[PDB]
Design a binder for this molecule. Structure first.
Ligand code: HEM
Ligand SMILES: O=C(CCCCC1CCCCC1)N[C@@H](Cc1ccccc1)C(=O)O
Ligand SMILES: CN[C@@H]1CCc2ccccc21
Length: 454
């Protein structure tokens, strides 16, 4: 039994000012490098413990001892994501009901049905790049976000955001980004009832209303038309939970659609951006991935079966997730009094944060080459120990979208490597912007077409 390390304090504000930064996850990573596998973090009326080692995270991932916690971030996002799957407690009736209805819509088998819609948006990206002039470059996170938002709009509810037709996001996206920004900024407000923030509160309510009205109108329009599409909205209007026998109601469907749009905007776009970053910084890896794309994607339109054969493209994605897990943390609570790691007594309800970037740098699992980008670490999935690699979270609360995200990212990265050579023309210095997720800010490349027809 051991005292937990704690970072530097600021009198009555305890550790809270350490996260008064636009890069709090990176700040916690530097704290974990200084203090090790566990540290306590105190704020007025709150204590969290940050876990970094596979030894402790494997215990935290025991669902008999720990359940998903809503972090204060997720509590603030719940003001517009409601009791959708991501912001619901495991014990809320709507969690298991939605989970049971939606699991079959997210299976590897279901990806066959979404493939044609993913191709539609991926071909729009490839055409955009084919149409750049010689003196032009690509804004990588900007284009990847146009792509993944459009893909989930089309597969989610047969709605075209038409992000490749725009400089300025669809108004829904404006309100969604600003609501996400307000949720994350509120973590840093030592005193949020100061009238200074009355404007933030009013803007936040107006952004929620924009989001509810598009989504409630889309649900209403689809029920009126009676149309049956191969999208998540049709599955949610028709599906019944085998346990309760109930379908989702319209309000909960709206929370799911908002949740899926947050995911498409924030996550897969980050993964593709990091993956392209690591490929242009590691040309041997780029050559090996481009060889696979050329050999496998032999048709102008990739098929579902061809995407499944892009093994090395999948290893590149996993290695990018290892170094920069675009969703960088998840929160747990102790279901009962327990001892973590034989050393750290916890009380029922005590909150843990898993720092996924630190888990993925545990040299006792990965070896001393942990900072190097080496997709070959993933050549043999069996060799990865349990709970060493957690970019999609844990157990029954793991990412329902994992097969969707990886199918889209593999398809798109495959097509990018088939169609273009890439240049790191600025010698880009990695600068990681934080929202809910991580993205490489300002990452730009030049593409040179291989002149292969679509
Ligand atoms: C590379 C892409 C993505 C990554 C890294 C990612 C990561 C994660 C992580 C870490 C969690 C666990 C959150 C927690 O424990 O608090 C999660 C949950 C979830 N993700 Fe994803 N995700 C991705 C893509 C998507 C997509 C495309 C969708 C939907 C279209 C989606 C929908 C969800 C939902 C609904 C949950 C909550 C599941 C539940 O608790 O029942 N994700 N994701
Ligand atoms: O560890 C953090 C800051 C990084 C969250 C990153 C997280 C946000 C969700 C999506 C994945 C990434 N937040 C904790 C602790 C906390 C609480 C109040 C004020 C300050 C910190 C929390 O939100 O409970
Ligand atoms: N995927 C889930 C669902 C939406 C989101 C946002 C940030 C981090 C993880 C997630």
């Amino acid at each position: 039994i051991k005292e937990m390390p704690q970072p530097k304090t600021f009198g009555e504000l305890k550790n809270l000012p350490l996260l008064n930064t636009d890069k709090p996850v990176q700040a916690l990573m530097k704290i974990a490098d200084e203090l090790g596998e566990i540290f306590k973090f105190e704020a007025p009326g709150r204590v969290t413990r940050y876990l970094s080692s596979q030894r402790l995270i494997k215990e935290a991932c025991d669902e008999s001892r720990f359940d998903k916690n809503l972090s204060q971030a997720l509590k603030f996002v719940r003001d517009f994501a409601g009791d959708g799957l991501f912001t619901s407690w495991t014990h809320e009736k709507n969690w298991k009901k939605a989970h049971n209805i939606l699991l079959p819509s997210f299976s590897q088998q279901a990806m066959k049905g979404y493939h044609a819609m993913m191709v539609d948006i991926a071909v729009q990206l490839v055409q955009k790049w084919e149409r750049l002039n010689a003196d032009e470059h690509i804004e990588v996170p900007e284009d990847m976000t146009r792509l993944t938002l459009d893909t989930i709009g089309l597969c989610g509810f047969n709605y075209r955001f038409n992000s490749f037709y725009r400089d300025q996001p669809h108004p829904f996206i404006t309100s969604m980004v600003r609501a996400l920004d307000e949720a994350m900024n509120k973590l840093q407000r030592a005193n949020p009832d100061d009238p200074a923030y009355d404007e933030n509160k009013r803007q936040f309510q107006e952004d929620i209303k924009v989001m509810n009205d598009l989504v409630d109108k889309i649900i209403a329009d689809r029920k009126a038309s009676g149309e049956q599409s191969d999208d998540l909205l049709t599955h949610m209007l028709n599906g019944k939970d085998p346990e309760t026998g109930e379908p989702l109601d319209d309000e909960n469907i709206r929370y799911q659609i908002i949740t899926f749009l947050i995911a498409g905007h924030e996550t897969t776009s980050g993964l593709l951006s990091f993956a392209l970053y690591f490929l242009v910084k590691n040309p041997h890896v780029l050559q090996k991935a481009a060889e696979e794309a050329a050999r496998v994607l032999v048709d102008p339109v990739p098929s579902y079966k061809q995407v499944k054969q892009l093994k090395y493209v999948g290893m590149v994605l996993n290695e990018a997730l290892r170094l920069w897990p675009t969703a960088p943390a998840f929160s747990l609570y102790a279901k009962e009094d327990t001892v973590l790691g034989g050393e750290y007594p916890l009380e029922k309800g005590d909150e843990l944060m898993v720092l996924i970037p630190q888990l993925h740098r545990d040299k006792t699992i990965w070896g001393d080459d942990v900072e190097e980008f080496r997709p070959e670490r993933f050549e043999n999935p069996s060799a990865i120990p349990q709970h060493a690699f957690k970019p999609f979270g844990n157990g029954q609360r793991a990412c329902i979208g994992q097969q969707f995200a990886l199918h889209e990212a593999t398809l798109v990265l495959g097509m990018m490597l088939k169609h273009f050579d890439f240049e790191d023309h600025t010698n880009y210095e990695l600068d990681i912007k934080e929202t809910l997720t991580l993205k490489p800010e300002g990452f730009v490349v030049k593409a040179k077409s291989k002149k292969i027809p679509l």
